[PDB]
Every structure is written in structure tokens, then in C-alpha cells.
Amino acid sequence: MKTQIINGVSLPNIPWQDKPADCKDVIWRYDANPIIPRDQLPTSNSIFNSAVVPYESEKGKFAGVFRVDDKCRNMELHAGFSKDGIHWDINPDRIVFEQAEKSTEEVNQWGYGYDPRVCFIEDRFWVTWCNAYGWKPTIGVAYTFDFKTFYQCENAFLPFNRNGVLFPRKINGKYVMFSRPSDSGHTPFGDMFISQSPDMKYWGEHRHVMGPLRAWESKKIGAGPIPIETSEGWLCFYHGVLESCNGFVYSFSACILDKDEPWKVKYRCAEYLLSPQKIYECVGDVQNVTFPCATLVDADTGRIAIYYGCADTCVSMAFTTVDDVVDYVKSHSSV
Template identity: 55%
Template sequence: MSKLSALGGEAAGAAVESRPFPWQDRPAGCDEVVWRHSENPIIPRSPFPGVQGIYNSAVVPFGEGYIGVFRTEKRTRFPLLHVGRSPNGLEWEIDPEPIEFANFESAPNHYAYDPRVVEIEGTYYISWCGGHNGPTISMASTQDFQTFERLENAFLPFNRNGVLFPRKINGKYFLLSRPSDNGHTPFGDIYVSQSPDMTHWGVHRWVMGRGGDEVGQWWQRTKIGAGPIPIETPDGWLMIYHGVIDTCNGFVYSMGAALLDLDEPWRVLHRTDQHLLTPEAEYEVSGHVPNVVFPCAALVDEPTGRLAIYYGAADTCSCVCYAKLDELIEFTKNHSAVF
């Protein structure tokens, strides 16, 4: 089995063997490279009283199970982050109170949504879209998911989809993002930035752009954004991302994948020329925001090459789908259009 850098590490000190991996085999008769969990959504829209949406959230291995940072919305529809815990990655208990940051005074305009989580050298870093004079990439760190230290925002407004790489590259931290605007951005490409200290970010490089008529890629013609933490493979960094098309009935969010160079992650080696998963199930096409498949986290079982991808559905509930890592890499290489 190839060397992998999956999400999360062993900072909690538990043996990997004691942690069950969330998984269902490919259904009989299915020839898709990615398939849905049969009991989706794994977290319904109201996991505890007063909540009407929980979606676009992050999951990592922790201890003998899994821990997550979840986007929730109560009846104010104001997004906040909550910690969740699971023994198997499928059954979740969500903390009813949102995360509080020990060194940060909250304010009414400090919203938080669409988090990602990664372990780097024993510390867990959380990135999300935070509201500080407009949306940008906010960050925090934790060792135990009980106390959280706010870090400086990575960028000026406006920016979204901040996704850290799971290790330093040539001694630097790397962060994917999508510069945007203050609204529901009708445009957007993926960029990568680097930092020596997780505070000062620069060397901003374009990674890849949206599709369109000239490349025949309508499913991602409006905007794209990085999803889960990139997965390190011998073929490059596997970056699962979302692509958006603007239709006469609104935006449609689908899932794609790309392979980035291991040492120069702004170089795209391969990129799927078709979506891997698009809104088709009832819980994806119907909800607060219809027609959304929004991947935010991925887990890899290294011995078996199994891949579990967590995604938000219709901006309402939390779901999971599956793939075999080697199959997904081969599909990406064999069905590729780099532009």
C-alpha cells in the first residue's frame, strides 16, 4: 500500500487498531467510482432542539474514535461552530454549545461556517470562513478539542474555502483558498499560499480555474473551491473539490478531484473532466439551499485504501460517501482535463 497522509494523527495516543472505519461496500450493480452511504444523512437537519441545519463540516480521527467541527444554524440562521464526537464516524453526538475561544472576545458579526480540520505535528488546526468586515479565512488551534486558541486571520476579506495541507512542504505551511466577494460569489478560482509560521501568508499562486464553454466543463463553469484536506499519495496531492454551475434555477454544487504536484502544489497534474458526485438524492436536491453536494472532510484507511468523504447536502444535513483511493486516483488520471 502506498504511503498516505490521511486526515488527523495520533496526538491523543490511542492505537489505530481500536478505531472502526466508516465504510460500506459498493452496492451491487453500481459502477460509480464514488457511492453514497445507504443511510444518509448520517446527521439529520436537527440533531438537537433548536437546530435546523448541520452541514459543511470537518471530521478527523481522534483517540479511539473521531471528532468533528460542525457548522450549525439555529432559528436565527446565524452560523456557528460546534464540536461533535463519534465512536465510528457515523453516529454523532454534537455539543449543544458553540466553540468558545479562550483568547478571543466574540461579537455579533463574528459568524463562522464551513470549517476544515487538520493535524500538523501534533496540533489540530481549524480553518473556516469567519466574519470580520466581510468573509475571510479564520483560524484556530487546539490540542484536545476542549480549549481553542484563536490565530490571526490568514487573509484580508474577501476569501473562502481555506484548506491547509497536512504537513509542511519545504519547511512552509501551505493553504488553499478561493478569493471571493461579500456575497454569494458568482465567480472563483483556487489559489495556494504559504507561510513560515501560520501567521504571515504570502507567495500567492494560482492553482486552477473554473471551467466554461472553451473547455466544455459546465459542471464547474461558475466557481470552484477546495474541499477536504489534501491527501498525500505517490501520484501527488489528491485534492477533492467542489465545482459550481449557474443554472436557470440557481447554483448546483458537485464534487470533483485533482492531483497536485507534491513539491509545487500550484501545479495541477490531473483534474477530473466530469463530476464524481452531483445532487441527485432527495436530501441533496431538497433543503434550505437545493442542489448542493459540498465536500469538507475525508478519511483514509491506509491498510485497505478505503476513502470516506464527508459532505454537506442542500445546506441542511451531513452525509458521507465512499471510494477506493487507488480507483479514484486512476479515474482522475484517466478522465483528466487540465486547464
């Protein structure tokens, strides 16, 4: 493989299907989508925009935190487990958080939570999500060792903010997190930023990554799954929004960020790599949405399995390789 995967994991059991010969795209879709239907739970209205990592437990080889919207249309997080990454056993009830320190007992009352991102850092799995603080969106922060008990920390930022995503290691001695300053509704703007922290409590040294650019991402953008570390830099899949007369179209693509100053863009794919086109992507609670919150990467082979929300209704899977993505991103770069 041309590009190397750095600080990765060997994943011979990664969910995978080979690219079809007729496929002329960088990314191809699993052929039995969705992998998680809207009604997998007795209480679920929809299940989408969800987080997935390798994890060995008694219930399989992968664990996750899943956004579940229930039949009240409350937004919640559920832990799940899978043997193959495709058929998922999702907890019937929501994650109920324990506070990590007593100092957040008063502040961190549960209201809602959605679009989780999860990555392993040094000794535990960190979770970020869009968390309500006084019914305002901000980035909630927690950790888990086992995906059974979850320990909530301080919200990283003031409202209004969404799409908080952690880099999977420290950079120049600090935790680094993507976020995306928003407003109190269906935000008509959005640039990606990073913020930095020595301790995962206090945040600062905020840095602008990039804003809307090409037509398919003209309205707003945000981070998607965990950044993937490569010899080229951080490979970061992100969503971008086009506004039609009838609303938003959510597609996603990738960029490559500088390894040590990840707010500096090296490459940025001018085209989307996947866009809402299939019936489960176009029809549903929110039409025309393909929204990636996790990927698995087999460092041995460069194989990527992408988890993405479809029409805010279900979870689907798509496939590609690091080499394919990096080559396309570099040869089809914006600015």
C-alpha cells in the same frame, strides 16, 4: 494497492460499506443518509459542511468541528464526537474561542463562522473556517489539542475569502493553504489559490492553482476536504458550480496536485464524481448541493469515507478508495 498513502494513519475502524454490484460510479453513497439530520440539536436549523478527523477521547474514536446554523440562521461552529464516525454526539453550544496570543484580543470578536476544515499538523489539530471579520468573510485560523478548548489565531487573509483549507504538513519549510478569493455576496466567480507561511501568522508567495473549466464547474470552484498525500501527488477533492436559470448546482470531483509545488495541477477529473441527485441532496435550505469538507483515509486499505453537506441542510457520507479515484482521475483528465 497501486497508489500508496503517504504520512497517513491506520484506520481499520473507518466507517465503511462495500460498493454495490449495481453501482457504476467511482463514489457510492452510504445507504442510510443523512448521518446527521438538520434537527439533531434542539437549537439547530441545519447541520452540514463539516470537519472530521480520527481522535481518541472518552466519547469515541473520531472528533469534529461542525457547522451548525441555528433557528436565527446564525452560522456557528460546534465540536462533536463519535465512536464509529456515523452516529455523532454534537455539543449543544458553540465553540467559544480563546485567543492564543493577547495581540488578537481586540481583533477577533465573534460574528459568525462556517465550513470548517480540520487537519492534524505535527503536534495539534488546526482549524480553518470562513470567519467574519467585521461581518466580512475571511479565513479564520485556530488550533486545538483536545477538541475541548480552541485557540484562535490571526485571520490568515484580508476579506473577501472563503474555502481556506490547510495541507496536512509543511512543504519546502512552509505551511501551505488553499483559499478562494470571493466577494461580499453569493460570489459569481472563483479560482483556487495557495498561499504560504513560515509561521501560520504571516502569509505570502500566493500561487494560482486552477479556475473553472468543465461545464459542471463552469461558474466557480473551491477546495473541499484536507488534501490527501499520495505517491502520485496531493489528492484533492474539490467542489465546482454550474449556474442554471434557477441558481447554482454544487457538485464535487478530484484533482491531483504536484507534491512539492501543489499549485501545479498534474491531473484533473473532467467529470464530477458526485452531484446532487438524491432527495436529501436536491431539496432543502439550498437546493442541489453536495459539498465535501472532510474525508477519512485508512492508509492500510485505501478506503475513503467522505463527509459532505447536502442541500445546506444535513451531513451525508459517501465511500470510495484512493486507487479507484486516482485511476479515474488520471484516465478522465482535463488539462
